[PDB]
Amino acid sequence: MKKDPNAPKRPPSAFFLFCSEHRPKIKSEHPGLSIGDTAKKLGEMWSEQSAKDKQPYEQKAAKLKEKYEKDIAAYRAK
Numbered sequence: 001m002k003k004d005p006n007a008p009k010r011p012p013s014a015f016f017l018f019c020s021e022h023r024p025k026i027k028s029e030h031p032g033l034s035i036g037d038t039a040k041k042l043g044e045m046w047s048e049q050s051a052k053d054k055q056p057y058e059q060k061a062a063k064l065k066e067k068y069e070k071d072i073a074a075y076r077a078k
Contacts, residue, residue: 001047003075006075006077007045007072008068008071008072008075010068011061011064011065011068012060012061012064013061013065014057014058014061014062015043015046017047017057017061018042018045018046018049018053018054018057019038019039019042022024022042022045023035023038023042024071025037026038026041029043045067065078
């Protein structure tokens with residue numbers, strides 16, 4: 001709503017990565033499956049993922065959320 005094309009992307013969350021990559025897969029075996037049922041299943045696998053699909057996902061959103069607090073400010077009206 002109050003974001004621009006030059007502004008930085010919102011702060012991604014670890015569960016948002018894992019789900020963001022497994023979102024188009026749950027819609028293939030479930031046509032019409034909204035983002036609630038697949039979000040309930042994914043969260044079950046996300047909390048079950050080991051370092052293969054969980055370590056590089058939290059270190060990409062955790063280090064991007066804290067940097068957004070200074071990025072958004074500097075881009076707000078420095």
